[PDB]
Ligand binder design. Structure first.
Ligand SMILES: O=C1CC[C@H](c2ccccc2)N1Nc1ncnc2[nH]c3cc(F)ccc3c12
Length: 167
C-alpha cells in the first residue's frame, strides 16, 4: 500500500490521474518524481518549468552544477538529483523532442529509466511541448515500465481521451 489517491488503474503496474504533477508531488512527497527534462537540464517550460518554479529555482541551481561537472545527458537518458521540496529524488528523464526532430524510437529507452525505481510519480514522456502523441506515449509506458508508475496528466480533455482510447 502507498498514499497515491484517486488514480484509475490501467494495468497491473500503471495508474493514471487528471492532476497537476506539482500539486500531486507536494501532497504525496513521493520517493521519486520524474521530470520531463532536456539534455541541458534547462527547466524553462512545460513540466520542467513548473517543477523548477515550485522549488524556487533550487532545481535549476542544482542542475547547472550537474551539467558543469558531467556535461549534457543523452536523449533517452536520465540522472537522479534531489527532489527538493517535492519528493525525495527527482529522476530527470529526457524523452525525444519531436519539435527538434529527435527519433521517437528513443521514447522506449527513456521509459526504461523508470525500471530502476520501484515506485514513481511521472508525466507522460515526450508529451506536451515535446510534441509527441500522448496516446502513443501512454502505450510505450505501459509496454516498457514494469515498476509501479503513477501518471499525472494535467489536461482534463487529454486525460479523458487517454482513458477512453486505452486498449
Ligand atoms: O498533462 C499533460 C499532458 C502531457 C503534458 C506534458 C507537457 C510537458 C511535459 C510533460 C507533460 N502535460 N503536462 C503536465 N502534466 C502533468 N502535470 C503538469 N504540470 C504542469 C505545469 C505547467 F506549468 C505546464 C504543464 C504541466 C503538466
Amino acid at each position: 500500500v502507498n498514499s497515491f489517491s484517486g488514480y484509475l488503474k490501467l494495468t497491473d503496474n500503471v495508474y493514471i490521474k487528471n492532476a497537476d504533477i506539482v500539486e500531486e508531488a507536494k501532497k504525496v512527497k513521493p520517493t521519486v518524481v520524474v521530470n520531463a527534462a532536456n539534455v541541458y537540464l534547462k527547466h524553462g517550460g512545460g513540466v520542467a518549468g513548473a517543477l523548477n518554479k515550485a522549488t524556487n529555482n533550487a532545481m535549476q541551481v542544482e542542475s547547472d552544477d550537474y551539467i558543469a561537472t558531467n556535461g549534457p545527458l543523452k536523449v533517452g537518458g536520465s540522472c537522479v538529483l534531489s527532489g527538493h521540496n517535492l519528493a525525495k529524488h527527482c529522476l530527470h528523464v529526457v524523452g525525444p523532442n519531436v519539435n527538434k526532430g529527435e527519433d521517437i524510437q528513443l521514447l522506449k529507452s527513456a521509459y526504461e529509466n523508470f525500471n530502476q525505481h520501484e515506485v514513481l510519480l511521472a508525466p507522460l514522456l515526450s508529451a506536451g511541448i515535446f510534441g509527441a502523441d500522448p496516446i502513443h506515449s501512454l502505450r510505450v509506458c505501459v509496454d516498457t515500465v514494469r515498476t509501479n508508475v503513477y501518471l499525472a496528466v494535467f489536461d482534463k480533455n487529454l486525460y479523458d481521451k487517454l482513458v477512453s482510447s486505452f486498449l
